[PDB]
Design a protein around this ligand. Structure first.
Ligand SMILES: CCCCCCCCCCCCCCCCCC(=O)OC[C@H](COP(=O)([O-])OCC(O)COP(=O)([O-])OC[C@@H](COC(=O)CCCCCCCCCCCCCCCCC)OC(=O)CCCCCCCCCCCCCCCCC)OC(=O)CCCCCCCCCCCCCCCCC
Lengths: 36, 69
């Protein structure tokens, strides 16, 4: 009848890791450097 | 907010295409130029009756200069 505490903790940890990875997917202001 | 697009390495396919095009063009542009020059400056032969008392060479029965050669 809902999330168990172990499921809650696992989901919280996985969500934090996923959000960190998705944030890391962003591009810096210079990332597409072009060769001469 | 630009994001990173995950793609398979397209460097090798592009390199192969560039190399194939380079070699084909390297050997074909001179061929096309020579064919055009031969056509423009050495036209095809003209049909004519065989003159009396004359036998033609085996290669004198074709009209295109490249085919004759
Ligand atoms: C690349 C990467 C990708 C790789 C992919 C894989 C590729 C693999 C390739 C492997 C090798 C290829 C194998 C092919 C070898 C075959 C060679 C051959 O036999 O040549 C054939 C043929 C040569 O014929 P020929 O028997 O030697 O000549 C007989 C006559 O004696 C000649 O008559 P002539 O005395 O009138 O002389 C004409 C002469 C000269 O005629 C002219 O110059 C006149 C034309 C323009 C005049 C119009 C006026 C313009 C100027 C006027 C303005 C200035 C003055 C006024 C200025 C003031 C303005 C007010 O022109 C020519 O001789 C033709 C040029 C030959 C070029 C053929 C190239 C083949 C080489 C093989 C390797 C190719 C490698 C690819 C690279 C090629 C290069 C990029 O060449 C042609 O291709 C002719 C094509 C003409 C067709 C016209 C288009 C009509 C389309 C109708 C169909 C529509 C439906 C839709 C389809 C559309 C599709 C087009």
């Amino acid at each position: 009848s809902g999330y168990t505490p172990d499921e809650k903790l696992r989901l919280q940890q996985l969500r934090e890791l996923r959000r960190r990875w998705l944030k890391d997917q962003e591009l810096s202001p210079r990332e597409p450097v072009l060769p001469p | 907010k630009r994001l990173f697009i995950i793609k398979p390495s397209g460097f090798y396919d592009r390199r192969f295409l560039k190399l194939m095009r380079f070699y084909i063009l390297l050997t074909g542009i001179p061929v096309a130029i020579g064919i055009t020059l031969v056509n423009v400056f050495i036209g095809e032969a003209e049909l004519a009756d065989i003159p009396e008392g004359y036998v033609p060479e085996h290669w004198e029965y074709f009209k295109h200069p490249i085919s004759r050669w």
